[PDB]
Amino acid sequence: MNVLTTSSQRGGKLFKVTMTLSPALSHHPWPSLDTYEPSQNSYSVVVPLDRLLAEMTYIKNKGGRVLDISPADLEALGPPDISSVAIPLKVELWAKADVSDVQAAIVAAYKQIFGNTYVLESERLTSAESLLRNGSISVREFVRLLAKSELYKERFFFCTSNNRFTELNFKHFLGRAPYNQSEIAAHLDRYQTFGYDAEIDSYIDSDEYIQAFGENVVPYYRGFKSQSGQTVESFNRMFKLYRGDAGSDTNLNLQGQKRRVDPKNLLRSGRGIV
C-alpha cells in the first residue's frame, strides 16, 4: 500500500490515497476491543480510477478521514534532482562594477530571493536597482530592499500563515531549512511585537547570514550540504522545501500558499519552552 510501483493494469490512472483509520477498517483478530496497528495510523493505498469513488465513500463512512489524493504517476518520479544546487555558483558584486556585472547580480537576486516565481517587467523594482548600480548600496543592502517590498509581501506573506512565511524566509534569505521548532516560535513572537519590518531584519542582520554571504554575495543555496549547528533532519526538510529546478515558490497554486514542512516533523528535532 505504501510506496508504489506501476500505474495501471487494464489501464487506469492509479491514485494513491491516504487516510486515518478507525478500527472499523482493519483491526487485529484479538479477544478485546478493536484496535488498528499503531503504525498504520495513516495509511495509504493505491487504487485505479474506477474503484476510486467507491473506496472513498467507504472510507469516509466507516469513520476514516481522507488526508490526500494524488496521482500515482506524479509520485513515482522520485525526489528532485539536486545537482544544480548541491553546490551552486556564487555570484558576487565587485567594487567598480562593469555595467553588466551588475546585470548578473540583479537577475540572480531575483531568482533566489523570490524563489523562482516570475517577476514580470511591470513588476521589477527599478529605483532600487538604480541604487545598486551607482554603488550607493551593496548586494546585501539590495537584498534587504526586496524583502520589504510589496511584491515580496504580497506573494509570500499576506496570503499564508506565519509558519509558512518564516519557513520561506529561511529558504530565501538563508538558503537553508528551519532547524527547530524554537526557530519558528522565536520568529513568530517577534513579528507579533515589533512588526513585519523588524522581523525581516532579523534574518539579514544575523550572524549566520553574515558569515556565509558577507555583504556582496547574493544569498545562495546551502542546505544540501552539511552546516554548523544544524540538526540532522534539516537535510530532509530541504527536499521538502525545494522541489526541483522547475519548482518555485508560487502563490498561485490551486490550494494556495501552504506549509511544506509538517509541524510534526519539526518537533522531532527537539522541544523545549519559549
Binding site: 556564487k90 558576487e92 565587485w94 567594487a95 529605483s127 532600487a128 541604487l131 551607482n134 554603488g135 550607493s136 548600496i137 546585501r140 530592499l145 531584519d201 542582520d205 550572524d207 553574515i210 558577507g214 555583504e215 556582496n216 554575495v217
Partner: protein, 74 residues
C-alpha cells in the same frame, strides 16, 4: 557614488553616514584563500536610519571592524 542618493531607501528619520574599517566582518571572497575582502573596501561608508543605527553599530564592533567616523547623512 556612495554619496548617498536621497534617503537611500532607508526611510526612517535621520540618516547617519558611518564609515568603518571593516575586516572580514563582511565580504570574505568566496575564494579558497584566507577570508580577504577587496583592498578598496578598507573603509566602508554606509547610510542607516536612526532606528537602525544602534543595532548596526553593535554588530559592527562585535564582528571586529571599528567605526572610523559618523556624520548625519544629509
Amino acid at each position: 557614488m556612495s554619496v548617498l542618493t536621497g534617503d537611500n531607501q532607508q526611510r526612517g528619520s535621520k540618516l547617519f553616514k558611518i564609515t568603518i574599517a571593516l575586516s572580514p566582518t563582511l565580504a570574505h571572497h568566496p575564494w579558497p584563500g584566507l577570508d580577504t575582502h577587496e583592498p578598496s573596501q578598507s573603509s566602508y561608508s554606509t547610510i542607516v536610519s536612526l532606528e537602525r543605527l544602534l543595532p548596526e553599530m553593535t554588530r559592527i564592533k562585535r564582528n571586529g571592524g571599528r567605526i572610523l567616523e559618523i556624520t548625519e547623512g544629509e
